[PDB]
Amino acid sequence: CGLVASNLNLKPGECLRVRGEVAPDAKSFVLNLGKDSNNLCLHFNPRFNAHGDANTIVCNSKDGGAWGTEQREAVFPFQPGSVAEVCITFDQANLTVKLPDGYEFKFPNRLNLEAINYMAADGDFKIKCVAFD
Amino acid sequence: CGLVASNLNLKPGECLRVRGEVAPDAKSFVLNLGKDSNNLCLHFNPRFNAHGDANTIVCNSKDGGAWGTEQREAVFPFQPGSVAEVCITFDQANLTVKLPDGYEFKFPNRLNLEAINYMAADGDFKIKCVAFD
Ligand SMILES: CO[C@@H]1O[C@H](CO)[C@@H](O[C@@H]2O[C@H](CO)[C@H](O)[C@H](O)[C@H]2O)[C@H](O)[C@H]1NC(C)=O
Ligand SMILES: CO[C@@H]1O[C@H](CO)[C@@H](O[C@@H]2O[C@H](CO)[C@H](O)[C@H](O)[C@H]2O)[C@H](O)[C@H]1NC(C)=O
């Protein structure tokens, strides 16, 4: 798979910035955030052409190994063959994901974790820069 | 205790750039690089005042869980309570740790691994930004 980072200790309100290159023939990519691979407060999955979906942002949680209820966003500000940046923060109610074009969406915080300690990237996205504040 | 990153897939000649905050009361900090926590082609350990050393960089390898022989430097361009930036690369012969100001540290490549896949920070160093080039 792709980059895995742990012991991040990202607290509420602190920003996680991730910049990467979207493959020219990208089918999808994933950024997973949470405690570990079984406990994700955000599974962020832009699907260019994957699982039957096209140009769709899919979000979900995973709690104790179990996928939660999936949600989708209508907008898709990713282009294959381009560099994309995503900035993520959270509070007790929502994750807030800020997207390249300045789009911003929220995803409910279903896990109640004190911090984001784990990030994993997968798929057609080559990570170039990760920053914390 | 600090950030741990895996699946880095950093190949010879590629550049790992790291920026972090050296704690105000720093006694020492560590950046570990290699395949995993038991196989380190570079343990890079600036000691302000730790383990009997004062303002000395200690470098070592770890191979199958076994520490190699330490290498020490006289030059010491780190200060507590400051931001430190390093650029790391390797080839067949050496690991090279470069600082913006032009300091360059070399440590023999003892493990001969195809890539750096693992990086970990420990001690009085908070990673703020990691980049791959
Ligand atoms: C039956 O609906 C589809 O189920 C798929 C299998 O669970 C699902 O794909 C998974 O989505 C999760 C996030 O919810 C994650 O991305 C896994 O990698 C996927 O395999 C599809 O998203 C579902 N399709 C719809 C339209 O809901
Ligand atoms: C007895 O000499 C000192 O031994 C310490 C313990 O082995 C050693 O510290 C360890 O070094 C490794 C790297 O080789 C790593 O930094 C560990 O975290 C340390 O606990 C000191 O380097 C030795 N000091 C001297 C002056 O020889």
UniProtKB/Swiss-Prot annotation, chains A, B:
Pfam families linked: Gal-bind_lectin
Tissue and organ distribution: Expressed in placenta, maternal decidua and fetal membranes. Within placenta, expressed in trophoblasts, stromal cells, villous endothelium, syncytiotrophoblast apical membrane and villous stroma. Within fetal membranes, expressed in amnion, chorioamniotic mesenchyma and chorion (at protein level). Expressed in cardiac, smooth, and skeletal muscle, neurons, thymus, kidney and hematopoietic cells.
Q: Which residues carry this modification: Phosphoserine?
A: 28
Residues engaged in binding a beta-D-galactoside: 43-47, 51, 60, 67-70
Q: Where, per the database record, does this protein carry N6-succinyllysine?
A: 106
Q: What does this protein do?
A: Lectin that binds beta-galactoside and a wide array of complex carbohydrates. Plays a role in regulating apoptosis, cell proliferation and cell differentiation. Inhibits CD45 protein phosphatase activity and therefore the dephosphorylation of Lyn kinase. Strong inducer of T-cell apoptosis. Plays a negative role in Th17 cell differentiation via activation of the receptor CD69.
The GO biological-process annotations, alphabetized, read as: apoptotic process; cell-cell adhesion; myoblast differentiation; negative regulation of T-helper 17 cell lineage commitment; plasma cell differentiation; positive regulation of apoptotic process; positive regulation of canonical NF-kappaB signal transduction; positive regulation of inflammatory response
Which species is the source of this protein?
A: Homo sapiens (Human)
Q: Where in the cell is it found?
A: Secreted, Extracellular space, Extracellular matrix; Cytoplasm; Secreted
Could you tell me what this protein is called? Answer: Galectin-1
In the UniProt record, what gene is named as encoding this protein? LGALS1
Query: Any signal peptide, and if so, which residues?
Result: none
Any GO MF annotation of the entry: laminin binding
Describe the subunit structure.
Homodimer. Binds LGALS3BP. Interacts with CD2, CD3, CD4, CD6, CD7, CD43, ALCAM and CD45. Interacts with laminin (via poly-N-acetyllactosamine). Interacts with SUSD2. Interacts with cargo receptor TMED10; the interaction mediates the translocation from the cytoplasm into the ERGIC (endoplasmic reticulum-Golgi intermediate compartment) and thereby secretion. Interacts with CD69.
Query: Where in this chain does the record put each Galectin domain?
Result: 2-133
